[PDB]
């Protein structure tokens, strides 16, 4: 009782990793939210990609621009919505990887390079 979206993902994981590229990690699946934290430490699929190791020496200065052309939005303006009495926060700290999404990603968009 499989689906077309599931079988188009898993067939990229049958090529070798010298050929398939980022598609070699396409067999991994979404786990519960507590599985990504401190006793268990399960790895997301974004950490196998080169976007997780991006740290350039260059930087945008932000005083080059005209006033009015830099925008900043928060995620909430509420203190117990940003951090509860427990430490389980989506926004502040090391507990923002404890979420029910984002274990898997889309690396079947581009190419096998």
């Amino acid at each position: 009782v499989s689906t077309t979206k599931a079988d188009l993902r898993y067939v990229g994981a049958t090529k070798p990793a010298a050929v398939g590229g980022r598609r070699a990690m396409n067999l991994m699946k979404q786990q519960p939210f507590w599985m990504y934290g401190p006793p268990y430490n399960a790895v997301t699929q974004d950490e196998y990609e080169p976007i997780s190791a991006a740290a350039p020496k260059a930087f945008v200065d932000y005083q080059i621009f005209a006033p009015g052309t830099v925008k900043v939005s928060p995620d909430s303006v509420n203190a117990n919505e940003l951090n509860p009495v427990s430490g389980m926060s989506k926004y502040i700290g090391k507990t923002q990887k404890l979420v029910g999404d984002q274990g898997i990603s889309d690396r079947s968009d581009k190419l096998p390079m």
């Binding site: 991006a54 350039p56 260059a58 945008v60 939005s73 968009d109 390079m113």
Partner: protein, 146 residues
Amino acid sequence: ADGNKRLDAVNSIVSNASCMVSDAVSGMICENPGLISPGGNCYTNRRMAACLRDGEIILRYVSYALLAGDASVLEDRCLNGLKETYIALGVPTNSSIRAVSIMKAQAVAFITNTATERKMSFAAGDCTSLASEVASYFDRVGAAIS
């Protein structure tokens, strides 16, 4: 031969490398200031960190192709798949040529030593063959994307 002119021109680019990329990708924002509005795609912290990483790889390729003296270092898998990698991700792929055309202007400033706020000490002589040699490499990169 004259490998001293070859080494002077590469060194003048790998010295001012991080100033070049941060001038290029911020002159690119300055022209369309909607890349860093909400919804734009240099807006978030990781999308900003990857656009900076791309210009450092591109300038590394042009700096290393100038040191060898051939465009055999240019093709890589970098020359092919950049135009398809940006369309698939969804990246303004003409605005990504503004950052390479800006970087092209700075490298022919540092080589011909006409940089309007930096002056370095060289010998006397000419470099306007090496300035064209690196204009072609900055054209091979900006033609592989469109």
